[PDB]
Amino acid sequence: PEEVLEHVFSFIQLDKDRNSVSLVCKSWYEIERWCRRKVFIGNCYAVSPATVIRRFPKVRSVELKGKPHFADFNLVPDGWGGYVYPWIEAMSSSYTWLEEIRLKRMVVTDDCLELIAKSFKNFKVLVLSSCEGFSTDGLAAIAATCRNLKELDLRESDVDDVSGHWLSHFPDTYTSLVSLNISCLASEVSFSALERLVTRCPNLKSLKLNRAVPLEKLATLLQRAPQLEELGTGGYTAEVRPDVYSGLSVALSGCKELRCLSGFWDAVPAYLPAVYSVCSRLTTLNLSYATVQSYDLVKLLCQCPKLQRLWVLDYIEDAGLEVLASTCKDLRELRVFPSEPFVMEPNVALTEQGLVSVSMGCPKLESVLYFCRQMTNAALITIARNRPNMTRFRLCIIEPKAPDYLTLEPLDIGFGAIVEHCKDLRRLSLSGLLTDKVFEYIGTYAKKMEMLSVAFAGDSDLGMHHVLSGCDSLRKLEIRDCPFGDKALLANASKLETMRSLWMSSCSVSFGACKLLGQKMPKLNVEVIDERGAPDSRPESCPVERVFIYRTVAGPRFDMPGFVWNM
Amino acid sequence: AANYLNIKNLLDLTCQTVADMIKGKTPEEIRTTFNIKNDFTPEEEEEVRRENQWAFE
Numbered sequence: 001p002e003e004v005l006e007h008v009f010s011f012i013q014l015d016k017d018r019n020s021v022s023l024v025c026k027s028w029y030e031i032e033r034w035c036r037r038k039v040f041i042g043n044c045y046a047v048s049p050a051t052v053i054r055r056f057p058k059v060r061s062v063e064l065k066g067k068p069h070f071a072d073f074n075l076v077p078d079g080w081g082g083y084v085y086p087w088i089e090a091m092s093s094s095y096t097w098l099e100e101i102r103l104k105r106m107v108v109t110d111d112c113l114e115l116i117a118k119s120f121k122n123f124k125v126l127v128l129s130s131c132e133g134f135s136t137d138g139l140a141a142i143a144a145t146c147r148n149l150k151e152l153d154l155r156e157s158d159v160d161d162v163s164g165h166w167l168s169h170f171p172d173t174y175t176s177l178v179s180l181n182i183s184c185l186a187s188e189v190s191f192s193a194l195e196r197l198v199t200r201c202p203n204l205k206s207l208k209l210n211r212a213v214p215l216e217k218l219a220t221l222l223q224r225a226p227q228l229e230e231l232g233t234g235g236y237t238a239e240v241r242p243d244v245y246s247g248l249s250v251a252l253s254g255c256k257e258l259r260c261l262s263g264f265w266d267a268v269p270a271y272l273p274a275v276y277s278v279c280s281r282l283t284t285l286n287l288s289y290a291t292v293q294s295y296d297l298v299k300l301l302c303q304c305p306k307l308q309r310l311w312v313l314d315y316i317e318d319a320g321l322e323v324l325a326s327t328c329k330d331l332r333e334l335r336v337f338p339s340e341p342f343v344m345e346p347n348v349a350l351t352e353q354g355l356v357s358v359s360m361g362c363p364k365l366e367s368v369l370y371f372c373r374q375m376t377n378a379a380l381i382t383i384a385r386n387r388p389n390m391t392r393f394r395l396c397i398i399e400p401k402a403p404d405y406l407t408l409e410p411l412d413i414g415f416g417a418i419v420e421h422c423k424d425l426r427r428l429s430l431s432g433l434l435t436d437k438v439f440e441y442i443g444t445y446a447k448k449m450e451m452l453s454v455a456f457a458g459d460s461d462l463g464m465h466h467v468l469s470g471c472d473s474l475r476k477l478e479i480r481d482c483p484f485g486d487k488a489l490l491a492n493a494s495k496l497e498t499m500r501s502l503w504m505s506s507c508s509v510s511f512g513a514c515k516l517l518g519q520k521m522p523k524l525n526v527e528v529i530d531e532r533g534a535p536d537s538r539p540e541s542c543p544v545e546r547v548f549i550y551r552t553v554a555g556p557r558f559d560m561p562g563f564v565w566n567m
Numbered sequence: 568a569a570n571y572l573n574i575k576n577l578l579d580l581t582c583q584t585v586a587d588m589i590k591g592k593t594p595e596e597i598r599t600t601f602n603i604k605n606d607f608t609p610e611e612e613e614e615v616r617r618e619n620q621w622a623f624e
């Protein structure tokens with residue numbers, strides 16, 4: 001074959017498969033780099049713009065992630081890195097046809113946004129997921145210039161709030177909006193501009209609003225957008241009035257294609273039942289910001305038989321979840337957030353009986369994130385016995401080093417059962433009183449695990465050592481405040497090359513061991529992020545504040561700030 | 568199926584299922600079940616894999 005291959009290859013879109021075909025023959029390597037539409041870059045520092053731009057020169061879509069995950073826990077101080085500019089500037093003159101840029105935890109600035117705008121004529125998709133460092137001015141520029149923008153998705157970013165003016169720069173000739181997620185903006189956009197905008201966008205399919213858009217106005221935008229597949233409300237409070245409740249209700253039943261609901265800030269129980277015609281076609285629901293008691297959630301959930309995803313505060317409760325269990329036979333992912341964590345005081349009656357219920361009740365539960373204050377190995381044993389198909393399990397017990405509250409034992413057989421019975425468990429996040437014994441379970445059993453997160457657990461480096469030793473599929477390992485150090489870390493030095501990153505903060509990894517590892521391992525960047533001043537100003541054997549290791553073909557980076565050392 | 572003559576829909580029919588031959592198979596599984604011969608000195612066939620898995624995956 002030949003130009004046939006071009007056509008055969010267009011059918012292949014997974015990175016794994018693309019990489020696979022690139023390695024099958026020199027000819028394939030070549031046809032492939034030429035006709036590859038998207039690149040996934042999980043770690044911006046693992047390779048460089050020019051290397052990417054020069055393999056893969058016909059790229060239409062680019063995805064990039066910066067800071068490690070524990071940057072959400074405030075464990076990576078400001079300035080660390082993540083600058084996206086070099087990428088924009090590199091692609092800025094190579095990537096003429098560029099359509100999408102999805103960035104996760106990056107630094108992004110107004111001149112980045114300008115440059116994106118000025119250089120990509122066909123530009124369509126911008127998702128900035130937990131980025132920072134731009135302002136509504138940057139948004140202005142994108143609005144004013146990108147004439148084919150289809151998605152402007154700002155999930156979870158710190159924007160500089162200069163002002164809502166930015167939304168009016170979309171010209172009147174602009175119609176192509178497909179997705180707009182401005183939930184993180186505090187700045188109040190102009191309601192006229194916005195409404196006028198929703199109306200001339202016939203393809204608008206997902207609209208997610210900021211708080212500043214009061215519940216009273218919801219109805220009006222919805223009558224303008226009756227094709228919405230997903231909606232995130234704005235403020236969801238008001239004087240209780242039936243003109244108001246009624247306009248809402250009608251507006252909502254107007255959207256026969258809604259599947260996704262969220263927002264619900266300051267929600268007034270009185271005004272939830274409007275959402276009910278919607279309820280029964282509904283796949284995702286997110287009630288995270290709704291601080292609304294159990295019975296209210298339960299009235300809402302009762303009529304969502306089709307529900308596949310639910311994020312909810314913990315205000316739902318055990319009784320809550322016993323309901324969900326009989327109700328949503330199709331639930332796939334459940335996330336219970338905590339309602340007030342810095343109080344040690346059960347303010348709700350959410351225990352482990354919840355999770356246990358859900359898991360007998362929903363044959364398709366495969367993803368869980370759950371904050372309770374108490375737990376037992378009897379629960380985890382049951383949970384694991386009931387959901388062999390579990391693929392993501394994060395548990396997060398609010399008291400740390402809290403043990404099974406009936407036996408006082410720590411939770412090792414607990415999580416042992418999970419790792420032993422969910423042979424696809426691909427992500428696992430731990431807590432409770434835990435000894436090196438759990439890691440032995442993990443390393444013996446967790447063979448597909450890819451991501452593991454650990455805090456206040458383990459006894460000695462033996463723990464970390466069964467993990468790098470045992471876990472074949474490990475990609476991300478991240479750890480804080482455990483008694484883990486030099487030994488496991490150098491004993492398993494080359495595992496680090498089969499892994500995307502290892503992050504360790506407040507552990508006991510000495511500066512001496514960091515140093516050695518950099519030299520044993522030219523190709524890892526081993527980074528000591530420590531804020532007390534140079535590490536060599538302290539004895540080699542003092543634990544660094546944080547060290548973050550990761551493979552790279554780019555070697556060491558150029559934008560370290562002052563409190564980061566490469567080795 | 569070749570073609571010459573350009574029956575655009577049917578290209579789509581074969582390609583989509585040849586492509587279906589390939590997805591989720593190693594560069595060997597492909598190269599075997601296909602009889603391409605590996606023309607990579609293992610120095611290049613290893614700089615390439617390190618790029619693939621470290622940077623693009």
Ligand SMILES: O=P(O)(O)O[C@H]1[C@H](OP(=O)(O)O)[C@@H](OP(=O)(O)O)[C@H](OP(=O)(O)O)[C@@H](OP(=O)(O)O)[C@H]1OP(=O)(O)O
Binds near residue numbers: 068104
């Ligand atoms: O594939 P990764 O590079 O490991 O990215 C993962 C992955 O995101 P994607 O699978 O969508 O690419 C997780 O997805 P799941 O584990 O849930 O399947 C996502 O988890 P969320 O569901 O919370 O989005 C997680 O996000 P996070 O790490 O913030 O929890 C994120 O991890 P990265 O930070 O490494 O991207």
Ligand SMILES: CC(C)(C)OC(=O)NCCCCCC[C@H](C(=O)O)c1c[nH]c2ccccc12
Binds near residue numbers: 369394395429430453
């Ligand atoms: C801590 C502050 C600054 C408030 O940051 C946040 O607001 N963070 C949002 C909390 C996200 C919840 C993620 C749970 C996180 C996880 O990986 O799912 C987790 C659960 N158990 C753990 C044990 C050790 C390490 C990590 C975990």
